[PDB]
């Protein structure tokens, strides 16, 4: 009873008077809520089926890309391999071997 002015639909058949619910085939509120929850969980599991892939500095969210870039721009001036800057914010450890890893 959240909406207190019910919609009046055009009456094409006389049984539309006897019917109360607009979409009978549609599941009820709580049922469709838990259905959508289960569907979102299944989609998230399908997405996380493979291991957590690690992304480079450019393919990072804006609140981390510039920080990760400025933390290493000092070492980027001198071209030498084997230079890592252990920054705090970033992709957390999955805790298991990953094909992308």
């Amino acid at each position: 009873a959240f909406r207190r002015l019910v919609k009046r639909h055009k009456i094409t058949n006389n049984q539309m008077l006897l019917m109360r619910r607009r979409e009978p085939y549609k599941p009820t509120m709580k049922d469709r809520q838990e259905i959508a929850d289960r569907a979102k969980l299944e989609e998230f599991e399908r997405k996380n089926a493979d291991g957590l892939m690690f992304v480079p500095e450019k393919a990072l969210p804006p609140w981390q890309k510039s920080l990760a870039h400025n933390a290493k721009a000092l070492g980027s001036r001198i071209n030498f391999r084997g230079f890592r800057v252990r920054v705090a914010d970033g992709q957390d450890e999955p805790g298991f071997p990953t094909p992308f890893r």
């Binding site: 493979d50 992304v55 094909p99």
Partner: protein, 181 residues
């Protein structure tokens, strides 16, 4: 259309392609100030069936030759970094194009991408072309053949194409340049 991440997970590609699976290939982006022509989309346009013949990409691209010339002059076609060239015209001389597309003051093409209800910062965008002259409906039909699934309206002043982004504006500019405007 290859899923690099899925291929790496399944073991079909080397694990060094994670940067390719995450970030797209770096390419000079097409802009209103830097006409970075894309050979792939131009080839797709050439393969698509259209009534009007388009120029070759070799003529659309500005010439890139030796730069040993001591002093530069005012040739219509000269070396330019942003890839600016005057309109080449029609591909086949024995034809009549029903429409004519004027450029702007800065030589930019008419394609401008706006947003529906931009006060709410709505991601839904649309394209407006308000420099077409001649038979606007022939241009509209060519836009129909280009974008089959999009909604294209036409008026006396502007042609609107709904649900197309800069990714479609660049295709429109490519087709216009290939036609010769």
């Amino acid at each position: 259309p290859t899923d690099v991440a899925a291929n790496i997970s399944a073991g079909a590609m080397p694990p060094e392609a994670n940067v390719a699976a995450a970030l797209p290939v770096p390419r000079i982006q097409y802009s209103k100030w830097n006409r970075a022509l894309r050979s792939d989309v131009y080839d797709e346009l050439l393969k698509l069936p259209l009534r009007y013949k388009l120029h070759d990409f070799a003529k659309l691209c500005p010439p890139q030759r030796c730069q040993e010339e001591p002093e530069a002059v005012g040739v219509v076609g000269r070396d330019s970094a942003v890839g600016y060239l005057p309109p080449l015209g029609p591909a086949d001389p024995l034809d009549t194009i029903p429409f004519f597309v004027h450029r702007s003051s800065n030589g930019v093409l008419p394609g401008k991408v706006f947003s529906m209800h931009p006060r709410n910062l709505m991601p839904a965008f649309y394209l407006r072309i308000q420099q077409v002259e001649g038979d606007m409906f022939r241009f509209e039909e060519e836009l129909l053949k280009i974008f089959p699934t999009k909604k294209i309206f036409v008026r006396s002043h502007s042609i609107y194409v709904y649900n197309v982004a800069l990714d479609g504006r660049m295709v429109l500019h490519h087709w216009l340049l290939g036609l010769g405007f």
